[PDB]
Symmetry: D2
Subunit: 443 residues, 4 copies
Amino acid sequence: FPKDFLWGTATASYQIEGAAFEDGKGLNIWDVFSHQEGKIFENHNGDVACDHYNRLEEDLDILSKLGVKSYRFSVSWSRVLPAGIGQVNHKGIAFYQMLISGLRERGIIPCMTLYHWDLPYALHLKGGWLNDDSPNWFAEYAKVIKTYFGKEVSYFITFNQPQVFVGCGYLSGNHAPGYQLPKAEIVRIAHNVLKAHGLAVKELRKGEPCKIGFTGASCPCIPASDRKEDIEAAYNQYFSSNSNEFVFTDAFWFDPVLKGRYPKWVTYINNVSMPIITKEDMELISQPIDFVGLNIYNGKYVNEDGGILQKKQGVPRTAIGWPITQEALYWGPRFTSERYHKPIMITENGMSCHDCISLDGKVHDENRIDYMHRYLLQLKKAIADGVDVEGYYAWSLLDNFEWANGYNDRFGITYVDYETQQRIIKDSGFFYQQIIETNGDLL
Amino acid sequence: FPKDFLWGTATASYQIEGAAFEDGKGLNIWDVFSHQEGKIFENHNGDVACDHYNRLEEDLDILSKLGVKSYRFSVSWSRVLPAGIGQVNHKGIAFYQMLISGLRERGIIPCMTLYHWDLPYALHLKGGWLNDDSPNWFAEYAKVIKTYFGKEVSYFITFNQPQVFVGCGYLSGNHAPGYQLPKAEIVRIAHNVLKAHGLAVKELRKGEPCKIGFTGASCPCIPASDRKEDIEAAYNQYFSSNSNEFVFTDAFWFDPVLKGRYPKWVTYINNVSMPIITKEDMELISQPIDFVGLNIYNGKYVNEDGGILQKKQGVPRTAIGWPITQEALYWGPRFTSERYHKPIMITENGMSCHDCISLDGKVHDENRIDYMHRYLLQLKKAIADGVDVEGYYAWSLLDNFEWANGYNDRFGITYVDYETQQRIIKDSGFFYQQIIETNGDLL
Amino acid sequence: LVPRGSHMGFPKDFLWGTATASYQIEGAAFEDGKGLNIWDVFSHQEGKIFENHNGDVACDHYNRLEEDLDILSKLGVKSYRFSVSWSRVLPAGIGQVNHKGIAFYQMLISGLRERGIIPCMTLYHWDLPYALHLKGGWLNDDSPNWFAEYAKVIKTYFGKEVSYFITFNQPQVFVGCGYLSGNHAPGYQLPKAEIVRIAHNVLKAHGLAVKELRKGEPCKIGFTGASCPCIPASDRKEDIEAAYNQYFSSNSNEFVFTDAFWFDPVLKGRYPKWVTYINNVSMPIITKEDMELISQPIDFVGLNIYNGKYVNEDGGILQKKQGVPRTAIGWPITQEALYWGPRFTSERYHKPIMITENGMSCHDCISLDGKVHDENRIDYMHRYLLQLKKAIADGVDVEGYYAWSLLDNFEWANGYNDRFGITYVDYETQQRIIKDSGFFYQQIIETNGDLL
Amino acid sequence: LVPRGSHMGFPKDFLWGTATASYQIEGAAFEDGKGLNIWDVFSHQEGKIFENHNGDVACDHYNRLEEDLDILSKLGVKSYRFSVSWSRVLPAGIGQVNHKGIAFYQMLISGLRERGIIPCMTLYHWDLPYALHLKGGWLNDDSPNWFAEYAKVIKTYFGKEVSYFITFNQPQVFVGCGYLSGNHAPGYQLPKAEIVRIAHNVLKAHGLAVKELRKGEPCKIGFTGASCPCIPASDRKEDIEAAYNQYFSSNSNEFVFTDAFWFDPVLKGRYPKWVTYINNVSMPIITKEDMELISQPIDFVGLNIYNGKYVNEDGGILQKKQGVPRTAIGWPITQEALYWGPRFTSERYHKPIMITENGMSCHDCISLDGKVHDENRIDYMHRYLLQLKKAIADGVDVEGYYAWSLLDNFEWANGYNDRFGITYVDYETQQRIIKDSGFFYQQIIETNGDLL
């Protein structure tokens, strides 16, 4: 691993902060969605979550104790702009200022996600990402971000996982705001998000220099073998998309951002209400960017011909049900490097485990250690084969609100007892600490 | 029946007009919704419908031939304001001008519905009835209506059946735009629609004098007997509503419009994102109105205690599946008269039949004749017992696009062969003609 | 097909009929020692039937036999198609005969003979005795022997007076809806291999039943299929061939509702080709002796036709026309179905055809004038019979036509929400009112369809 | 209950066991004349099982008997609980015994005796012979006689060497999931009256099986229930009473998954009161002779306990705590269930209890070090056994505890996605790796639980 390699841990505003209805914070779509009967596992919500808004100091101390180089967090748009535009809320700004000072004080590099799915409710009432002005709303947010944090923060990510907040939010309907919209409206929302990204980059370039990223949800295709043919088939499957399956793919989002073009098929869709995609739109979307964010939890194995192989019977898996596929943190970085020739940051990687406090009062998560050890060995091999990887962020610092699954999935290197809000560092946290101290030399 | 009694027939823009993408007409939510896979019976849509935009003269001639006193139609908001606000489309205005001249020329009183569910798509993209400004959008529409039609049209209905376009549009999701929103969002939309109504009334009062109505979907409770006790129980059931069942009720919509108050329970709901309902809102909503529109197709029988009785085994029914309950056109008018002390117009009454062209080349609909005869006898009895009823509009002039059921339900007194667009007046049309000629004396 | 001549019209001996089924009309479900059937239990299960309707009472025809026979006489009907309740005559489905049950059908058959009406007896119209269901129903190896025992009791007690038998009504529906889709009793959704097992047991049951019905008095025996005829795009030889091929097609993923899957075994002594190649877990062993038992000689093919589907030049199903004339149950009106169905079935099997059911669900009510006006049913009947007449003209041997139904009745999972009757039934009073269609049909019978 | 005091701990003769079931481990589904069972057919139906998994091969334990017996020896297990495949020893479920089938279980039982391991034989762990399903399965009046014939064959061929029998494993699940919810074979959703009929036929089957198992060698006979114990809000007499009452409650709308519905008939010779008042169509006739047959004397009550539910002072079920410790199958970890379940069952029936199943699904894998580390399973086992120990201390007679399971295996509708084993199985190679939990359990057995 490089000497400057960003050894990180990651969170998101709604998943940890709590204090949902305090200090003039505006409603977001997850406040409303999570309160709707039957949207969340056992009607869990992020009203309180890890109460991190009120326990900032303790969590910064855990970050210091683990020896984490970088902290990836999201800003609550609705906390800093309660109506999403206009009046800034300084109590909101103050929280993130106090966070960023805490980080600088401890020599931890801030990595700021602008959008981790908590759209201000006031903007949702105006049609959210269906609204022609939604890119301008986001630009205004991005300008406020640079204004108040541009001095101290030099790492920005515009959007976390558009695949999920657009796919699950507006196509499948299992995430806020919980819609199932026609293809034309999905493409309209995707285009408004990508243009929002363009305007946000422009805003973030005004003043202090910084590194700006775009984070994709990625399920890398793992080749059947090292044979050139099998590798090519995996590459092709990985970057494929069509009118009936695009919103969850890499190419549909990354080609516009990095190559300034949508996949071929997008030009041929003539559905009623399809948005007008102009050359100026594509030039706005494809602003120069410093790194590609990859959120990789697992991949899929493909045959010689790039067909997806049946998951092996009894494949090692996680508490959320996903398979453990170590090679995903090799092939995902590699193929993304080959396609876009950009520095890669693993902005999320981690595992849901059925964690508990043992009789000895500790949290033993050997499955998470093995997952982390296996995946980091593969990331190491990718760096060895010439993939430029600038860092790796463990999802997550804390067990937290896992969206439609509520608190039923624990991704943390730190356990949270929700009765007391007690943090207990898991074996995985101490294991990760050793990796950072040794810059991954002993994996 | 009174000498001035408005013997009418009714239509709606999207159900008959066609010409969906012509003469600068803007998209509406039904253009987009009806083109979504699986939203409509056999993917029917109103692209062409009865092609009434292009066959206006023939349909006016059928109106004349039947001897209809009044014609109830809706204006396509998206035809006269393609983006829903700003630029008026005069080709759109011209169509309705030509309709209204055709009506005046034939001595037929125009009854103009402003909103029959075809929300401009541009406003939907801005959040539709969730948007704070949606009442102002509607006011702007209502002002354009009065401006261009206030001279010739003296009968206006702001909203047709908010129960259905809000309930089916945004709660059950079977109507455009096809959402299933939490209670708080339904109340927000209801409040925005009722305020829209207030602003629209104010707009329609500026200039020529006119009669303005509000039309409710009504399923009247029919008492077990003429006993005072049973009648009281039916009245109470009819005007009941609660937090878990309100959007399809009469009182939830009519109390705000006519009494300037929501039902008691509404004040006590504190759900996340609930709108703030102010005394000024309630005063805006409760503008003075000239008649109550009732769309009555059937009612429900209630026991002595106002509990809804199981439908009788083999109850006479219609091709859409609804029961035939003749007394509904007595008790609905009567209870609405008793509660609000306002003139009533039956703005819709009619029956879906499995109509076809017989071997003799005619359309025989005796079931529709019997339905109409039975229901009008009950309306006559209501007038006799002192209910002020100013008119009755047969739904519909033409077989048409019956929303999520497409063309599978025929409500017309005129048959439409969709292969040729040929109109054939049904036996019911000639029966209705005789009723109008005889002012219902021979029922 | 060789034309017969257009002049002749309907034959002079043509069986002008009306049809019913036991569970749909009889009521008296728990009386005179009658055993439970699968529809008694299924219809009492929450949410199985429209508004939890059941056939406990139905048209109370068990108790109003005389009035209904008088309506049959008044209409001048040549033949009456009815089903025997297996569970009424054999309450446990085998062993002890119930003579109170036998007595009812004796009294019916005497009433018919007395009025010069030819009885047409359906043995099985879906009301499997519950005692046999508890023994696995049509999954049981012995189910064909249970049915044989039933068919023997039928011939024993009714063979003297009844000379027209139908073993099974619409196996497509009682097997497809009963055991694949699960919307009919007993309401199962079984794998393909179990559907084939049940189909095979039903077809063997049919074989044994034919053998039983041949012992003693001579009779005409039929097998009734649910048929949705493919209507060709045009009269072009190519389009007709494509429709014929689509109509008689079947495969492992779509067979239970087809004609060929049921009729090839009965009439040709073979299943479609694909059946021999299926090796699914639990597949039944289909032997040459099974196929010979199934293919007993039969006198007519019963067709229950309500509508068909229009197919393109290549036999692909065409989109239904926008606003196509339809019925109260939602089905389209497709008059040519009662031409092409009889014709293709005649061409394939070279057998006499009886239209064992044809009719229309209408939203019927008692008008202010106290009558039931069903012009839509008249037009449906007139249009369909014109097409049947044309089929006879083009050389299809058609021995009769049974209007579904004599009475409005219990329409299975739809309960009393669908009225198929030429006679209206008010379920509050059990009053019968003959509809306009009944008087229209009377005129057709009187004139042997000469004026259609 | 009279206390023993905490010092003594587990009895000296305490049966430290591990458990399996035939279909979940054996494989060899279509070999050595083995008949089809309902799980062979159900698991081959599209979409019935997670990723269309099936038990065709499972852990291939039929072919790897010796290796698994060696793991049993190495762990030092006192008792092995396994099920006999009915369809392996009687391919048509009755009549012709299959000696190749008998031979397998003979070789198993010899392997066990040879290693000083006490066999605990489950007759029925859900694999109903398919031939009997075709005859209506547990709906058939004769189903108890089919089971008696099976139980007679069991005693005949294994009565010499096996002195521990369990008639039925978890009727709650094979009846509830098999015939009410429909997520288990045969996958039906039957009315209440059919569920009661099946329950009654199963309980009578149990009666006849006990009678059969008493003929010849002396033996201990059990009945195993699926139990979700109610855990009281506190130690207050009133909160404990409310939990006891909730735990043993049942009514017409919620009975099939309860303890009392199954155990009252078996142990007290009566159904809950409400059963006598149900008059649903097709309800079976429950006679005093039926109840006397069902309530044959038995030696122990089997409890399969994985977790319980927390109840308030009034016995109402409390909302599960936010982030409650849970397992890979999604169930909560509720340690006190293995106290309160044994205790309340002891108080109600005054019978010896065996924990016939207890264990945890974990997301287990082979670590980089080539071992399987399952500390969550160790903690689960340690916590639950501490609670069982406390129950023994407070005077509950507990004769043994069987860890579910010896091997990771086919977890029914979840396929191989849930690993319950103290031994890991790589399904690609069929390699067994003993997990940390296996070595932890070995130490507990060696020390008779003295160090818990």
